[PDB]
Amino acid sequence: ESADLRALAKHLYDSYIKSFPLTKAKARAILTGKTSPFVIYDMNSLMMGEDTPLEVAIRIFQGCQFRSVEAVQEITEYAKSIPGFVNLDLNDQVTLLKYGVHEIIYTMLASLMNKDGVLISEGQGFMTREFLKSLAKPFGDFMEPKFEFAVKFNALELDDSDLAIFIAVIILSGDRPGLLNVKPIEDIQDNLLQALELQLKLNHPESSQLFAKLLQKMTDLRQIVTEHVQLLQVIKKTELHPLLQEIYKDLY
Amino acid sequence: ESADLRALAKHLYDSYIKSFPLTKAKARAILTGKTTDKSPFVIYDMNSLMMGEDKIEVAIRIFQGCQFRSVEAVQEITEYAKSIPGFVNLDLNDQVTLLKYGVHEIIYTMLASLMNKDGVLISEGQGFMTREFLKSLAKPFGDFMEPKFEFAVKFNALELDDSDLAIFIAVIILSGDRPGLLNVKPIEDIQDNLLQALELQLKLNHPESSQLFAKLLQKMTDLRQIVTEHVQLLQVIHPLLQEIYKDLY
């Protein structure tokens, strides 16, 4: 029943707004001429951006690291709002979060991104892509895939109410390793995919196959995480915040 | 025909899953360190014993507690047997003579899935009672569990999984040497077919393991020796079990 699906969509959108403060609409308002944040483009501009003696990439890197730990509490709160979720084997509840969190972190980071760079700290600042492309040797290309994805993903032109269902669809995947009770998982996701599809048909009629195109984005998204951990295997060789270790262990 | 035996194996595996909630793939998950969020309560002595009631003579409180899942295990076993191709079509009392003598042999086989060196999972994998704690009980219950642990340690070295276990369960059911059997020919017909399927299954799942088939059929001796030694030990001291101990041997 379609109205049951629309009700599903509104519940996720409402919950989404409560869990996540820097929504895409806000961020796109900031990024456009419709509100102002300090721009970091080289690093003369970086440390006038502190308002320091004497490596910058590591507290950028660990800066990134702790928005990850802020985002995890939000996502987890969000997930609790997905109908059928808390009612799952708590062992699958953490497998789902374990393999869902970075895919969502990167989906939502594209919202705070355009082709020049990325909104940082609740919209306070804006660091550029070419500046991130110019960081210290083991780093300096850790953002570039996120950016490549951000442009392709933002071309779909999703808004927050699309993104709320899509985020849920990611969490309830029936292909996570460690998934014991699968049938309840695929049962909810199949319902979320119907809601999404309907939500795509109403909100973007001009877009042919937008559903399809979006599901496909899931492959670049997975590829972001997979490449980032094999990047993470170059930093503790050659040359990280607790909560992350546990997520990264036994992760393919 | 090879592919049919495979097909027979799947039918058995799927019914095994359905009829048995506490499986070995999950039971081991608990027992290893792979369930990194929900873990069972340990009962390793007296003070840990009862502080547990809020989480899961005391000779009896464990004793009957066995019997009721033993009497509960009976349903899902008996339930299982009716998915075994050509079982319902058997004789309707060699059907029950078969269930009669094998029920325990099976429960003891599936008890080993929930066992390791230290103790045994209980109540839907919510508790875990140590073997030493069992050998230290009142009465002569004090060694009511020990042969079964002895069995498990040996049986688990065979390293069997559920899809292996599903088939072996059926091989036990359709014996061909219960006493109460008259229409025996059609049962040794089905077991002939189950054994082919087991043997082919074991070739595929365990190449590395030499004569795993024969080693596995041999475990059947110790297996019924357990049920045997068991009610020699139930003379020294529920309704449904009593029917079942009916001069069993």
Ligand SMILES: CN(CCOc1ccc(C[C@@H]2SC(=O)NC2=O)cc1)c1ccccn1
């Ligand atoms: C340029 N930007 C935006 C990038 O913001 C993020 C980039 C990557 C992540 C994923 C983290 S980083 C890691 O190793 N693991 C993770 O989960 C999370 C956020 C900055 C820069 C400084 C401070 C905060 N933001």
Ligand SMILES: CN(CCOc1ccc(C[C@@H]2SC(=O)NC2=O)cc1)c1ccccn1
């Ligand atoms: C240590 N464990 C696992 C043993 O679980 C069982 C042990 C024996 C049986 C066979 C029963 S006992 C008897 O005399 N006759 C029977 O048919 C059935 C189950 C506990 C401990 C407490 C409660 C339940 N389990």
